[PDB]
């Protein structure tokens, strides 16, 4: 249930960040999954940051699921990630989506969820931020 994970992000303006956190996921319904996570992030530009996010996956079809992520950070920055996850293979799925903020300017992104071995799942996120930069993140969790 509770998986420790580490995030590693790089942006086209050479701003990097490393995060450490845990995620506990529950199954509220047979086609509905919820998740809560908290992490500590160290950044190139803003030093330290703490973020708390809630996730949810709702089955839309046999291999499609609606994913939502709500995140708020200690620097008073928040966002909303809404994506549709398509399961391609038993250990492979893609989830193109968009990030929302009160500052508007919806930011498109894509997640690639794959399992590197039995006890490791990796989530690769490629997002296009509102500052015209591109951020590539690598999330590794211990299954």
Residue numbers in the entry: 5 to 147
Paper text:
Our results demonstrate that it is possible to systematically design transmembrane β-barrels with conducting pores spanning a range of sizes and shapes.
Such cylindrical β-sheet configurations are strained as a result of repulsion between side chains packing the barrel lumen. Glycine kinks (glycine residues in extended positive-φ conformation) were introduced into the blueprint to relieve the strain and to bend the β-strands to form corners in the β-barrel cross section. In the water-accessible pore, networks of polar residues were designed around the canonical TMB folding motif Tyr-Gly-Asp/Glu to optimize strong local β-register–defining interactions while alternating with patches of hydrophobic and small, disorder-promoting residues (Gly, Ala, Ser). Although it is perhaps counterintuitive to expose hydroxyl groups to the lipid environment, we included a small number of these amino acids on the lipid-exposed surface instead of hydrophobic β-branched residues to further reduce the β-sheet propensity. Despite the inversion of the hydrophobic exterior and polar core compared with globular proteins and the almost entirely local nature of the side chain interactions, our approach enables TMB design with atomic level precision, as highlighted by the close agreement between the experimentally determined crystal and NMR structures and the corresponding design models.
